[PDB]
Design a binder for this molecule. Structure first.
Ligand code: 8K8
Length: 383
């Protein structure tokens, strides 16, 4: 009902613009008033979810009120036999059409929640960096891993989330720009995995060989190990930019349409990254094995601390070990959903997931960065 009325507005407007006498103008204008009044009571297909009195509907009916105004002016001029001014008032109708009818509810909640997770992730991890860095008594190895991890979460709130909003609004950009958007979250996630594993190793050294601990874990070795973790995170992270991507399909569909050059796409996450890289390489190699090794390490640490029971040092190491194991478990728990979504994508391309569960998985994956400082300060209050 609305579409045919719209096309009657268009065609009849062209009839007035191609008219010779005033009878054609007046008749076409009557038709346009009928169709405009009949379409003012309609609802656009885009506005299914918006309420009947929502601002979109009032702007719609308002624009149609202005429209019927212009139509009534042109008609009042056409009844007087002034075909010139009637055609002019017909020329204004295109401008009124341009300002209005030529121009997100579920999505806005996602955007806002992302902004919230940013406003919790950035200042909290900055606060951790303050508490450890500014204090001179906190220049340890585990403390250095903590500092690096807090840096990673700060960058998650400051980079991964802003780019996570710009990937959702989806602008039309080049292909490589979408990779440059996609890689930082890979890098930072791998960096967090390696940081947690390094904390586990440092705990195992503090509980198994304390007698020589401070003489085996030199601060030089702390810097070397941290730098190695960052480098691993960049190698595993910038692998898609090295050439492992779904550029073949995008470029094939780009040449099938006849166009040639740099492909331009919506910049979705799924179209620029090969799921073989996410599943086989980024996960089955650089996520799951480190998790398993951390499990074995923490089991050994708890075993040694349990068998070794002055008492205060080992009780303290037990508290720190509890906190570390808890944080690692919350990392794996907050990060496994997205990975399992990748695996379901690779293994069953036909099975399509409800969007709500994906939004939840992303809320967990990005939200853990805000979850770390809360649990950390909580465990400071415990000990
Ligand atoms: C260890 C680091 C994890 C990195 N990573 C992903 O692994 C990841 N998978 C996905 C999905 C969700 C939906 C079904 C499958 C294909 C696409 C689209 C799964 N989106 C991801 N995103 C970005 C999210 C915000 O747009 C992401 O950063």
């Amino acid at each position: 009902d609305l579409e045919d009325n719209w096309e009657t507005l268009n065609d009849n407007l062209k009839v007035i613009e191609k008219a010779d006498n005033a009878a054609q103008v007046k008749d076409a204008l009557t038709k346009m008033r009928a169709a405009a009044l009949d379409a003012q009571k309609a609802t656009p297909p885009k506005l299914e979810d918006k309420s009947p009195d929502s601002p979109e509907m009032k702007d719609f009916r308002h624009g149609f009120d202005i429209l019927v105004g212009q139509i009534d002016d042109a008609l009042k001029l056409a009844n007087e036999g002034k075909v010139k001014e009637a055609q002019a008032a017909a020329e204004q109708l295109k401008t009124t059409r341009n300002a209005y009818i030529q121009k997100s509810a579920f999505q806005a909640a996602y955007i806002g929640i992302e902004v919230l997770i940013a406003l919790v992730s950035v200042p909290g991890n900055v606060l951790v960096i303050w508490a450890v860095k500014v204090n001179q008594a906190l220049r340890d190895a585990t403390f250095c891993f903590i500092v690096s991890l807090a840096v990673a979460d700060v960058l998650v709130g400051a980079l991964v989330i802003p780019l996570a909003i710009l990937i959702n609004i989806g602008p039309q950009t080049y292909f490589h720009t979408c990779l440059m958007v996609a890689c930082p979250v890979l890098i930072l996630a791998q960096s967090s995995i390696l940081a947690l594993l390094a904390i586990a190793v440092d705990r195992y050294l503090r509980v198994k060989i304390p007698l020589r601990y401070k003489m085996v874990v030199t601060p030089r070795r702390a810097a070397v190990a941290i730098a190695g973790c960052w480098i691993l995170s960049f190698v595993v992270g910038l692998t898609p930019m090295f050439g492992w991507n779904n550029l073949s399909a995008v470029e094939r569909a780009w040449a099938a349409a006849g166009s040639m050059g740099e492909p331009v796409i919506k910049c979705e996450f799924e179209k620029v990254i090969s799921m073989e890289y996410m599943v086989y390489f980024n996960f089955f190699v650089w996520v799951l094995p480190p998790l398993l090794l951390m499990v074995l390490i923490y089991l050994e640490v708890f075993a040694l601390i349990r068998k070794q029971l002055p008492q205060k040092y080992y009780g303290k190491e037990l508290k720190i070990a509890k906190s570390a194991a808890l944080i690692a478990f919350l990392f794996a728990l907050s990060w496994l959903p997205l990975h399992i979504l990748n695996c379901i994508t690779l293994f069953c391309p036909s099975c399509h997931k409800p969007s709500i569960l994906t939004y939840i998985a992303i809320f967990l994956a990005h939200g853990n960065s805000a979850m770390n400082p809360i649990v950390y300060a909580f465990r400071i209050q415990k000990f």
